Each structure stands twice: as C-alpha cells, then as structure tokens.
Amino acid sequence: FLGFLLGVGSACASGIAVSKVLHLEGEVNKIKSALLSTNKAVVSLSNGVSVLTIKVLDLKNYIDKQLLPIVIETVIEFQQKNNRLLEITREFSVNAGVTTPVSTYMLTNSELLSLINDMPITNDQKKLMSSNVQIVRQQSYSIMSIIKEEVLAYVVQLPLYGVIDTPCWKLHTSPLCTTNTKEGSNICLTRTDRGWYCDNAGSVSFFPQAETCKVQSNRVFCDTMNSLTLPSEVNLCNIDIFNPKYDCKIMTSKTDVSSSVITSLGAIVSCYGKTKCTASNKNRGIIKTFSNGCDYVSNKGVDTVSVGNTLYYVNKQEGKSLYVKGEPIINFYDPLVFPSSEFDASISQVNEKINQSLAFIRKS
C-alpha cells in the first residue's frame, strides 16, 4: 500500500554507463583482439570496469570462410546461425535498446550458467544463481551499445545478491470493522504496513508492494530499489500495535466491506454485513461458516475460501500456523470522535486527532 513512499531511481543507468564508454575510440579494437584465442576472456576498460567480454556466434568465421568464394546443405546451416542475429535485431527494434527479461536468443541457458560460473563471486552465490536462473533472467537487463567495426556489442546487466540467507516474513493485513446491525455507523481500520520484510544490516528492508518479490520455496527474491529501509522496531506492530517505540501505519474508513486475504499457510477473512463467508474442503464441502468480523482459517483441511460471490484457493504449502486470540483494536475506538477518513495515517496520527477533538467537547 505504502508504495507511494518509495524513492525513485534509474535501474538502467548502471548498464548504460558501460554502453556509453563502449563507443570510445580503441574500445572496439580492444575486445576484438582479446577474444581471438578464446570465446570467453576478462577485459579491463578505459573507465575502469572488470567486464567479462564473451564472443558468441562467429559470423565472420562462417561468411568469409564458407560463403565468400560463391558470391542446399549450406543454406540451412547459414539459416540456423543467421536466425539468432535476426531475432536479437527483432527484439532491439520493438524494445528500443533495453530488453527485460534477457531472452534465450540474447544469452542461451548454457551461456548464462557458464557466465555465472566465470564471475569472481562467492561459491555460495553461484549455486543460488544457477538453481534459480529463471529468476536471474527475469531480474536481468540487456542494453544495445555499438556496431562500429565488424562486431555487434550489447551490455548484459545481471543481478547481484549482497543480502542472502537472512530471515524474511510476509505481512498480510485486512480491514477490521465494527459489526453492528445498523446500515452505517461502522468504523473501520486497516494496517497499511502490509508487504515483504527482510532483516538486512541492523535494519529491516521493507517491500510495500509484495507483488515485486519472487518466492521460490523459502527464498524471497526482492529488489532493494522497491524497498524502504525501516528500523527493527517495525516488528513491534505485530506483537503490540500501541507500542511507544514505533508509530504503526494504519488507514481508517467506514467502508464496511467483505474480502479475503490468502496467506501462505491459510486465509484471513474480513466478513461484513449480509455476506456469505465460508471455508470449504474439496470433498466434505463447507467446513466453516464465517461470522461477522475478521477471523482466519488454517490451510490444514481447507482447500477453498469463498467470500460472497468470489471463490479463492488456499495455498497447500506445508507449515504450522498459530491463531493469536485478542480483542479487536477497533472496539477501543469510540465511534463518535473517530477520524473516519485517514487514507494514510498511523496509530498516533489517530490518537492525537482524538485527543484534539475531545478537548473541544470537554471545555464546552
């Protein structure tokens, strides 16, 4: 929700910096000589970058060595090798130079796995990258630079994971409203601090738009650029929302609406009004009928959750989930004097607004 709080930057500027220098005088001639003996060789740049330059598909050693004296067994062989440059050019035309993810034509799986293994990185980081190449591909960029002299060059920006194996936790939130018989008069409250949280260098890297995180098994792949770096005291909002150490983000409304959030090991159900909220098993049928308010059901046994007319599927991931019973926070708030429109607020922004509005009543 708090995605509007995120800062902005250029993700391509890192790889474009290598592209802008690739147009510098001898630059083109430097890599040409180094890649004559072997197809893969480490190159030092004028700007001073440790760049792994790789010569993939040699058209000069095929056109001048097998098609030059003539100008069906050789046309099909040429078609096959020419196809890769025909698809790379097709991609750079519609994507205006920058392409993401990096296609198989741009870099093959055998080439990518070898490119990861040739990097001067940790033995641990290599395996993580190799086992999740599909995620690495998705995270990577490919920028067009120069064609200059008898060699086509394009910069491939791969991701680096400085933070690895540290704990992560997904926070799911849903609206908490009062459940009275009346048409209106219902006050609501939703925790806006929903998203992915990863412990990182004394702080907590928080990803408010959890959609920007890829999860393979336990591994949470996120981009720091999509994070806000928050103090460890942020986790206090889960155990004590009224803690003085941290001002817990919340949004207030009167929008008494039924919905369901499908968590990792179950589902939260915000059931309001005349809504049919139900948890069901594939065989047995309806195993739970949700009463008005905010409840939750574990994935163990339950296969589906239906709220009104929208059926949701529970995640069948193995794991133990604990129901922490407690009085719903919204009961403590007085329906009159409550600020029912705070779209982006906090526990204090509300308590201060109440303290202020109560003072006008007391003096009169």
């Binding site: 100008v71 069906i72 205006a96 130079g97 067009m144 491939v156 591994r219 720091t224 889960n238 939260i268």
Partner: protein
C-alpha cells in the same frame, strides 16, 4: 517446521515466518559480442534472400546504436 504463520485477531493481520533473503543489492555488467562479417539458379537465390536478411538486420542495428535508451523513471 520450515515455514510458520501467526494470525493476530486484534489487528486483523497474519505474519508468515521462516523465509530467506536473496535481495538484489547491485548489478554485474558484461559485454556480449557477436563477430559479424562486413560485405537465376534456385540454390543461389535462397542464399541471396538469406544474405539480404543479414544485410537488412545489420543496417537496422546501425540506426538504433546511436540513440541511447532508458528503462523509464519516476516510480
């Protein structure tokens, strides 16, 4: 238990614990190069039609290289 979960009835929220990071901190840049050649019978017209495809491709990349690109910005 590898993965765990906690549901707070008081705040209408749930926390899914037991995950491990793989946060993208920076970037590794690499230059990918392709060594290209500068240049009535049915068997000779097909190799011409395919060499025309190669020439048109190299001429297309020559117009793109000058223009410098960007992902986008301001999000």
């Amino acid at each position: 238990q590898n993965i765990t979960e906690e549901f707070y009835q008081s705040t209408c929220s749930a926390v899914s614990k037991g995950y491990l990071s793989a946060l993208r901190t920076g970037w590794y840049t690499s230059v990918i190069t392709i060594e290209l050649s500068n240049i009535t019978d049915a068997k000779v017209k097909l190799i011409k039609q395919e060499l025309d495809k190669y020439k048109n491709a190299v001429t297309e990349l020559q117009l793109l290289m000058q223009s410098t690109p960007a992902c986008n910005s301001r999000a």
